[PDB]
Amino acid sequence: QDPCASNPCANGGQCLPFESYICHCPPSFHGPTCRQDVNECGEKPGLCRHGGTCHNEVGSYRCVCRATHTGPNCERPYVPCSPSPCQNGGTCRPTGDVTHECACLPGFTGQNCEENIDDCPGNNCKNGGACVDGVNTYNCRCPPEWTGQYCTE
Template sequence: MDLEMSPLGYQCPCGKGFAGQHCEIKVNECSSSPCPHGYCYDMVNGFSCLCKPGFAGLRCEQDTDDCILNACEHKSTFKDLHLSYQCVCLAGWEGSFCEQESNDCKMNPCKNNSTCTDLYNSYRCECIPGWTGQNCSEEINECDSDPCMNGALCHESSIPGHFVCLCPPFYTGKFCHQHYNPCDPLSDPCRNNSTCLTLVDGNHYCVCREGFEGEHCEINVNECFSLPCQNYGDCEDGVNNFRCICRPGFSGPLCDLDTNECSSRPCKNNGTCVDLSNRIMCICEPGYHGSLCELDMNECEISPCLDGEDCVSRTGGYNCLCAPGYTGKPLSALSVSTYGYL
């Protein structure tokens, strides 16, 4: 017996899973870490591995392939991760399984209020006037295409997509493509039978008839503005003339003539007519009165007959009826002039 191997003079042959002089020590089969991706459970003369998710095998040495379900769509590729996987989508597809077509307009690639249309793995921008380029980001100079005709000058507007043509004389229209006559009878700008003259700069000039004024001879001159009617007459304006409506006692085109109201001999019974301003005065013969001397005066009212004799009035005088035994001339009639006004 080898004393170095058996210092106690004997040796115990241990069964599997035990060690020690007397086989009292249980061998820890997990001390060598046999389960690299799991938990090791020590057993008598062995061990058992409890694998972590994603691994399998007696020692958890096998990586489970999560891509085996083949859930990624549209020819996308799989990327195996720990306990999961990831679909690597081809261009134009998105989503967890690459099942959704990508919307390339989502990031608003079209500029300047243009419209974006989504295509397969692409997009198309529909530009508004004044812009061009794939993303409508390039401004167009509308004058580059020389749109103005007949020698007109093109002026680019501050508003994208717009321009203005500065036309030479006798041309008009958006592109200066229409020839025009400023004095065309169909669109004659001069009114009231005035004469239209064409100027060398393409404009017109209106020669107005008397009684009209204004750029287009559209204004009727007010001939009453200077107050031509005299003696407070009313003025009525006409076309290149006026008419005066005179107040009573005045006549003439300008109401400047004092009417002779005595011309019609308005005073009766040989009364004398005196013409005054807008009125007359009649100087009546003795025995008459009234505004026109039309009334016969009753001379008997002043009792011209003596001794109470009866008085008989007559035209222009009176008679006394004397009592028997009396005779003689009556008192002289009063020579008093009577004035009548009208």
């Protein structure tokens, strides 16, 4: 005769007997069986600090920060070069309050030096050798019957 044996609650709620039953919900859900989402933005205005916009979700919320701030609740100020966004040992230079510039190392390119420049366009791999791109170079993956740097030996 346990009413909780049927498992009436959902989304992490704990069933407890009382007189029928009750579902003790986690803070992210509410209602008789924890099936309705709590709007965190509505319960605490200014949840996303420094003029951030709160967006409610099923089981959580997300903060949309303005360019000048960062963090889960837009609390940490945005510094263009700390943490540094440039990839592959690239040097970061700030150009403004929110804009930045990456000085790429030879071989890399793009806004944040994330793209490796393809060195295969003018490759000299012969006899069906496949050009494999590297950092400022390339190597030919030769078929089994051919050897050498350009698949000629």
